[PDB]
């Protein structure tokens, strides 16, 4: 199938409680494979996938050094952004970034990503061309100027097209038994009386990987989008995910309702009904 690698970085200032915490977490699809945390008591702890451990101390030493430099850079960037927004030194602020690459089944680049948010708001992003920037406001235009002057996009392009793709391919090979395995949802429908007059039908999907899934209810073959309660897909803790979708149905009309499930691990999409 297709795959992605993405790092999710968070720098958080905490005036009066030390230097800003910096955490960088790496994922292949929905699998976390590395974590670096400036608050780590012992580097012996920062968790990593078994297939990362096999890369040895050279890989770990190089990545640890990159993380340490990234910590310094984002801390300074936090300082600069506080200034760009005329903010007091007293408040806590957050700088986040996401970067990485999407590849197809053939392992070829689909597109790259490198973008940033400040206090939860989009700030600057590398465009799909991997050459130009989109700045959200006059503050981010300053960052854009600095990054154009230093040719940062060219470095990021080289990473996204080269390093990112090559390492994603390597991780997929080393972790193939998990990373290239899609686990289909285990599905069933439950029935929950509300009153004499109506009941909830809940369609369940359990144990699936990756997280992407489509779960819908139809009534007489018509999508019930507005009438469906659909919970966010949620992690089970064993790598897999769960989701449900529910509709309120008049007593006696249950068989007019069908649940539809689509997921990468299914050879065929499912159609389910309440089975009393």
């Amino acid at each position: 199938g297709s795959h992605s690698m993405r790092y999710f970085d968070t720098a958080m200032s905490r005036p009066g409680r030390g230097e800003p915490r910096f955490i960088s977490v790496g994922y292949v699809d929905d699998t976390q494979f590395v974590r670096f945390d400036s608050d780590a008591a012992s580097p012996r702890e920062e968790p990593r996938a078994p297939w990362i451990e096999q890369e040895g101390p050279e890989y770990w030493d190089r990545n640890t050094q990159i993380f340490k430099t990234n910590t310094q850079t984002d801390r300074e960037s936090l300082r600069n952004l506080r200034g760009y927004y005329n903010q007091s030194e007293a408040g806590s602020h957050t700088l986040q970034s996401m970067y990485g690459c999407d590849v197809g089944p053939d392992g070829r680049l689909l597109r790259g990503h490198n973008q940033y948010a400040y206090d939860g708001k989009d700030y600057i992003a590398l465009n799909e061309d991997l050459r130009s920037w989109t700045a959200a406001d006059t503050a981010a235009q300053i960052t854009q100027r600095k990054w154009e002057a230093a040719r940062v996009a060219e470095q990021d392009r080289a990473y996204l097209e080269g390093t990112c793709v090559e390492w994603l391919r390597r991780y997929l090979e080393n972790g193939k038994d998990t990373l290239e395995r899609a686990d289909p949802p285990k599905t069933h429908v439950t029935h929950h009386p509300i009153s004499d007059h109506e009941a909830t039908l809940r369609c369940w999907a359990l144990g699936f990987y990756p997280a992407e899934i489509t779960l819908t209810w139809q009534r007489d073959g018509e999508d019930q989008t507005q009438d469906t309660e659909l919970v966010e897909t949620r992690p089970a803790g064993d790598r897999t995910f769960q989701k449900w979708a529910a509709v309120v149905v008049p007593s006696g009309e249950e068989q007019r309702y069908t649940c539809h499930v689509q997921h990468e691990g299914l050879p065929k999409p499912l159609t389910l009904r309440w089975e009393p």
Partner: peptide
Amino acid sequence: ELNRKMIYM
């Protein structure tokens, strides 16, 4: 593999 952040924003 981490990307190198070098230039302050």
